[PDB]
Amino acid sequence: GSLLRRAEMYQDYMKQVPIPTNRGSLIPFTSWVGLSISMKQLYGQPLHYLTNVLLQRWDQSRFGTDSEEQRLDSIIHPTKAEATIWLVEEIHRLTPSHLHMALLWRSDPMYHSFIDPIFPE
Amino acid sequence: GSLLRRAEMYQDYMKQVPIPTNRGSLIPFTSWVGLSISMKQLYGQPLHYLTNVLLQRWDQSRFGTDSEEQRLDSIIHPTKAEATIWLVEEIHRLTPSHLHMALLWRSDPMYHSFIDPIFPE
């Protein structure tokens, strides 16, 4: 039971934040974490713990390559880029239980660093 | 350096498998792992380690809920469902380095269980 009441409030909140249906034009970006900052600023909504943690791991997964430096938007186009993160986020606003998050949270000592603050109205 | 030559062959392979542009109609499914079996059978291609591991965790993330049993396709529509996994997979066929996979692999003692076999021609 530890973490539950916080993981309950946090998942009962995010499930309520609607995924935006009207989209803007292509957002240049150079990391997945960078891209998603551009989306919360522009659309004014938080992304879930699970979306911010998977995007740190997409970015981390690039280190170590042999190729020379290449902007990520030369690889993944900003149009499906954005779409991704709007699809990953929906799964996350709907499907996980709050017992899951408390679980994960009890195992990640930095979990609050992947939770967004309160956004404006 | 351990795992590299296998992680090299495996990521230099998957980056070459083209993501299918012609899509079929909606695939009913009841788990993300179930959905993606329906996609490899139907489209004849393997999904990456990183896509099969994230889909075990999407499914795992549902356990513990308070709601009664509900098919996942009552929550996420099979049309964006499929699209997801085609977007996650592309990121994975293009962006990770093979030093990343060997890293992950050295830390996951069951990594081969998330690698697909060889598919037909």
From Swiss-Prot, chains A, B:
Location relative to the cell: Nucleus, Nucleoplasm
MF annotations from Gene Ontology: DNA binding
Superkingdom: Eukaryota
Statement: the UniProt record of this protein carries the keyword Acyltransferase: no
Phenotype on disruption: Impaired accumulation of siRNAs, reduced DNA methylation, and loss of transcriptional gene silencing at RdDM target loci. Impaired RNA polymerase V-chromatin associations (Pol V).
Phenotype upon changing M9A: Decreased binding to single-stranded methyl DNA
GO biological process: gene silencing by siRNA-directed DNA methylation; siRNA processing
Quaternary data: Homodimer. Interacts with AGO4, RPB205 and DRM2. Part of the chromatin-remodeling complex (DDR complex) that contains at least DRD1, DMS3 and RDM1. The DDR complex recruits/activates the RNA polymerases V and acts during siRNA-directed DNA methylation (RdDM).
Protein name, entry field: Protein RDM1
UniProt source species: Arabidopsis thaliana
Source organism phylogeny: Eukaryota, Viridiplantae, Streptophyta, Embryophyta, Tracheophyta
Gene name of the encoded protein: RDM1
Residues of the full protein shown: 42 to 162 of 163
